[PDB]
Structure 1
Amino acid sequence: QIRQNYSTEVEAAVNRLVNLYLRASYTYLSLGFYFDRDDVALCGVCHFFCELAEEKREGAERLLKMQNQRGGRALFQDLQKPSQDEWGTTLDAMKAAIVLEKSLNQALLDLHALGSAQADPHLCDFLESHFLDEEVKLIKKMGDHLTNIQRLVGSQAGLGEYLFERLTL
């Protein structure tokens, strides 16, 4: 047995956080393929979301690795289908992405508060090291994108959506 200072409550919340990262990965998978449709065709938006799918997957994998390192047991649940089949405009999609990110970020903060109350400094360090700053950086970037997308709608939405995709993404 290696397990030491690792509460059952932290273990369960780690498994839930894995499910949340894998669900986010799947959402981004769906977002990316929507933007590859012939009737949507925004290559840069596609690559943005498919890159996010991969980051969220890797996030999950790091959590699973840590779960094993601490002597927890990984437990997998169903992955819920993404919340939409079609994602609207780049604007709608980027709003939905930031809502999702803020939910992951809140889950990280809740897990951290749990870690602190359980006096589990390895867990707190792990989150700080690999998750909290990355999520803050990602959210700031999405925020910046959203501001630029919004700036570009004005009178000519098609034009703005095209330019954004060509010159930013």
Structure 2
Amino acid sequence: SQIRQNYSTEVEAAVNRLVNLYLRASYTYLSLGFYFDRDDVALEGVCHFFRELAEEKREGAERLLKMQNQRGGRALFQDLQKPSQDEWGTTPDAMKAAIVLEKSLNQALLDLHALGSAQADPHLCDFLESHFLDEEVKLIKKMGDHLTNIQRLVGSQAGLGEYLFERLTL
């Protein structure tokens, strides 16, 4: 590469793996969104919450891909595994799964940061901090807040509580 400078093969590979992880996350959210669009589930707030997250994750993958190219690495794509469920249960089930997923992304970002810091790659470490790390923290807090509110509600009376959350928060 005519441009590549201070960009370890280890970081390049990990960036390609993270791209896979984000695209998988986008696919999981696509499936979550359409499940809540089913006529026998019918929570349009929840549907839109997860469809908007599908788009965020995709956009995360694309920004990683752009950076890869900016640093003179080579994008390499793998099979995208299907999501881990075909049916996603109730709103708390789905929000719990979303939080699990985000923690797995966040840990992958933290791992990749630690690798860049080992590799003395400050550009990478800035890039993650600027575009990914605080976004995850903010999103996980929001999901935490949602779960707490869903759990308050559906402890009370499940069907009613799930409706009211979708109506009045989402």
- State the TM bucket, normalised to the shorter chain: over 0.9
What does residue 68 of structure 2 align with? Answer: 67
String of CA shifts for 1:25-45, please: whole Å, max 9, x gaps: 000000000000000000000
Deviations 1:107-136 (A, max 9, x none): 000000000000000000000000000000
Deviations for 1:64-103, whole angstroms, at most 9, x for unmatched residues?
A: 0000000000000000000000000000000000000000
In 1, distance between residues paired with 2:132 and 2:16? 15
Deviations 1:1-27 (A, max 9, x none): 100000000000000000000000000
- Separation (CA, whole Å) in 2 of partners of 1:162 and 1:103: 29
The separation in 1 between residues aligned to 2:22 and 2:156, in whole angstroms, is 37
- Quote how far apart the aligned CAs of 1:53 are: 0.1
Gapped regions of structure 2 (runs ≥ 5) = none
Quote how far apart the aligned CAs of 1:155 are.
3.9
Give the TM-score taking structure 2 as reference length. Answer: 0.99
Output the aligned Cα RMSD.
0.4
Runs of 4+ in 1 over 6 A off after TM superposition: none
Cα distance in 1 for residues equivalent to 2:48 and 2:119:
40
In 2: Cα distance, 1:29 partner to 1:9 partner:
30
Tell me the distance in 2 between the aligned counterparts of 1:22 and 1:122. Answer: 23
SS of corresponding position for 1:154: helix
TM-score normalised by the chain length of structure 1: 0.99
| d(CA) in 2 for partners of 1:155, 1:14 | 45
- Find the aligned partners of 2:32 and 2:58 in 1 and give their Cα distance: 15
| Contiguous gaps of at least 5 residues in structure 1 | none
1:30 is aligned to 31
